[PDB]
């Protein structure tokens, strides 16, 4: 029998425009690289709401629907950092195809169970020490701060997590952190407030470039009442992975539910809420030095969202 395989059925969503598509530091053409685009997007670890998982704290929720949106986005950006740290940015996922052990090690760290390094359980409970009740909605900085504390227990990754406050990135503090225990892989998270009710148009160009760097981990934030993990953009639209879908907790690891095998959702940049957190991953010091060099070159046309200072 001869079959029609319906190639590109998944793109029945995406627009036509020839404007390039940027995904975490990678550029693609909608015309000739659809397969590459879908492969890159589907390979990212996708975390949605889950239900019927062990009660958080013994007597807490068995589901995070409705309140875990920003926690899930935090998981996705941190997982991308882990993916880059243990598998590399060139790694790609394929269904039913054997994946490296490090892959299952990364995925396991995010499974919905108390024993996992970055599970909803660990995040919600660590969040209490940050003044966040279990079940209370999170902002970008809060989840980034909780992740930093949880990464301390993860010796397998041995990451250096720097959260730059006050729109300032102090190179000297980062070097001392990454050289302290020679260079621990760096996860740089920068919480920002790009305006009062909307994002100032002057920041739009700078934000686009934040997705165009090799070290780009993307951005977490969302539309009013909807957290998203932004992985890039196309034209005047941001592309993202959405956690607003409740799926059964994985009860064995069958990983199909952790990959979004469709072109990413889109939203106008102008609809972006001003409260965000931009992330960058610098494997080695040379990668960091390269990042600084790039940030410095952004003194183009486009007001900076953050400033790079030495001391």
């Amino acid at each position: 029998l001869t079959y029609d395989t319906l190639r590109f059925a998944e793109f029945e969503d995406f627009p036509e425009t020839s404007e390039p598509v940027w995904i975490l530091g990678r550029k693609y053409s909608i015309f000739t690289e659809k397969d590459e685009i879908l492969s890159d997007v589907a390979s990212r670890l996708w975390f949605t709401y889950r239900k019927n998982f062990p009660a958080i704290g013994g007597t807490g929720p068995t589901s995070d629907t409705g309140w875990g949106s920003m926690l899930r986005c935090g998981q996705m950006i941190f997982a991308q950092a882990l993916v880059c740290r243990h598998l590399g940015r060139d790694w790609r996922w394929t269904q039913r195809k054997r994946q490296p052990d490090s892959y299952f090690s990364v995925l396991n760290a995010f499974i919905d169970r108390k024993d996992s390094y970055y599970s909803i359980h660990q995040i919600a409970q660590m969040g209490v020490g940050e003044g966040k009740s279990i079940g209370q909605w999170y902002g970008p900085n809060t989840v980034a701060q909780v992740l930093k504390k949880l990464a301390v227990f993860d010796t397998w990754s041995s990451l250096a997590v720097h959260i730059a406050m006050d729109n300032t990135v102090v190179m000297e503090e980062i070097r001392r952190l990454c050289r302290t225990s020679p260079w621990r892989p760096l996860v740089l998270l920068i919480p920002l407030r790009l305006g009062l009710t909307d994002i100032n148009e002057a920041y739009v160009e700078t934000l686009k470039h934040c997705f165009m760097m090799p070290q780009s981990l993307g951005v977490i934030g969302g539309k009013p009442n909807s957290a998203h993990y932004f992985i890039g953009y196309v034209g005047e639209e941001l592309i993202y992975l959405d956690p607003h879908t409740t799926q059964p907790a994985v009860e064995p690891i069958p990983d199909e539910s952790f990959h979004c095998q469709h072109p990413p959702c889109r939203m106008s940049i102008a609809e972006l809420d001003p409260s965000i957190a931009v992330g960058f991953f610098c494997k080695t010091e040379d990668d960091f030095n390269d990042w600084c060099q790039q940030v410095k070159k952004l003194s183009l046309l486009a007001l900076p969202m953050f400033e790079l200072v030495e001391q």
Partner: protein, 119 residues
């Protein structure tokens, strides 16, 4: 409750500035209030500040963080005319020269970040 601009008329505010600058020629009169939409950060006792013109944004941000009793870990942003101030060596005197209001005061609002969740 009313903001500073609502409690004192424009002509009245212009006079407040004339007097204060007369008595303190090396100070910058600054109005710092919590953003109307901000809900997590506390409200300050005072909203009128007289800042030595050499004080930079890094120092201003830190002392205001202290006034609010915040930990370095908590999200805080000081916005002038809609944009956040970076923790840098820029003197308040330069910000005043380029961002001050027509009434003579330099206005700022502070905020943290919104939280997210779904229905």
């Amino acid at each position: 409750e009313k903001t500073f601009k609502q409690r004192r008329s424009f002509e009245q505010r212009v006079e407040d500035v004339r007097l204060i600058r007369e008595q303190h020629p090396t100070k910058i009169p600054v109005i710092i209030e919590r953003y109307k939409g901000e809900k997590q950060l506390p409200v300050l006792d005072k909203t009128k500040f007289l800042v030595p013109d050499h004080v930079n944004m890094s120092e201003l941000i830190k002392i205001i963080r202290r006034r609010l009793q915040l930990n370095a870990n908590q999200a805080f942003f000081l916005l002038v005319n809609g944009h956040s101030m970076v923790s840098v060596s820029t003197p308040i005197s330069e910000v005043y020269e380029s961002e001050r209001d027509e009434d003579g005061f330099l206005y700022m609002v502070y905020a943290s970040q919104e939280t997210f969740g779904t229905a």
